[PDB]
Design a protein around this ligand. Structure first.
Ligand SMILES: O=C(O)[C@H]1O[C@H](O[C@@H]2[C@H](O)[C@@H](O)[C@@H](O[C@@H]3[C@H](O)[C@H](O)[C@@H](O)O[C@@H]3C(=O)O)O[C@@H]2C(=O)O)[C@H](O)[C@@H](O)[C@H]1O
Ligand SMILES: [Ca+2]
Ligand SMILES: [Ca+2]
Ligand SMILES: [Ca+2]
Ligand SMILES: [Ca+2]
Ligand SMILES: [Ca+2]
Length: 198
């Protein structure tokens, strides 16, 4: 395991980091602490830590408290080995259509949702651990566009609400090697037949 060369450094930011289409932001293990961008509460007016334009990628960062409004993804993004030490309002939001992959990493202490899906998308979560969360995935409430979610090699502890929730009959969730400790209801979708194993 190669700890990254920025391991032990702390980058304190005062504005959202924009990653442009075709770019990969590689933190090399840096921890980021945002200031003046939110308190990580449930208030909806916080700034994202990162804005990933379409086709932008992010890897190898630790996001410290306050988690603010996390990572805004505009589609066709790979988010790799990102650690949310303390999720803010939410950890990552899909803001526009495309494929978004969260691969590796982990999240902790999400008062409400970890992942917010606010546009039609294909959303994959792979090799990921989350503990003390409300929900892992929430399609924006009362929307009926289609998302397809894949949960692959995902381990969840202490889920207060549910693993995933959608109000869309056309959305689907697919899982493979999903382990869930301490959750009363796995999936809150219009019908349970929207949920599949593979
Ligand atoms: O992108 C965002 O941050 C969106 O946050 C809000 O919406 C989410 C969710 O999509 C809503 O259904 C609603 O969720 C319910 C409740 O208010 C709370 O989140 C928790 O008890 O879960 C409920 C549920 O999942 O149905 O509000 C959510 C929230 O984050 O508070 C906004 O309403 C959206 O416009 C986005 O800004
Ligand atoms: Ca919330
Ligand atoms: Ca919200
Ligand atoms: Ca709300
Ligand atoms: Ca949010
Ligand atoms: Ca939190």
């Amino acid at each position: 395991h190669h700890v990254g060369t920025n391991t032990g450094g702390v980058l304190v930011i005062t504005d959202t980091i924009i990653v442009k289409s075709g770019q990969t932001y590689d933190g090399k293990g840096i921890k980021i602490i945002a200031q003046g961008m939110g308190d990580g509460s449930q208030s909806e007016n916080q700034k994202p830590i990162f804005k990933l334009e379409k086709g932008a990628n992010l890897k190898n960062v630790i996001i410290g408290a306050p988690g603010c409004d996390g990572i805004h993804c505009y589609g066709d993004n790979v988010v790799e080995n990102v650690v949310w030490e303390d999720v803010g309002e939410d950890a990552l939001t899909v803001k526009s259509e495309g494929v978004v992959e969260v691969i590796g990493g982990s999240a902790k202490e999400a008062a409400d949702a970890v992942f917010a899906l606010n546009a039609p998308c294909t959303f994959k979560v792979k090799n990921f651990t989350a503990t003390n969360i409300g929900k892992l995935v929430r399609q924006n409430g009362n929307t009926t566009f289609k998302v397809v979610i894949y949960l692959e090699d995902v381990t969840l502890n202490n889920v207060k609400s549910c693993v995933a929730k959608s109000d869309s009959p056309v959305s689907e969730l697919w899982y493979h090697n999903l382990n869930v400790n301490n959750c009363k209801t796995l999936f809150e979708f219009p019908s349970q037949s929207q949920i599949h194993q593979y």
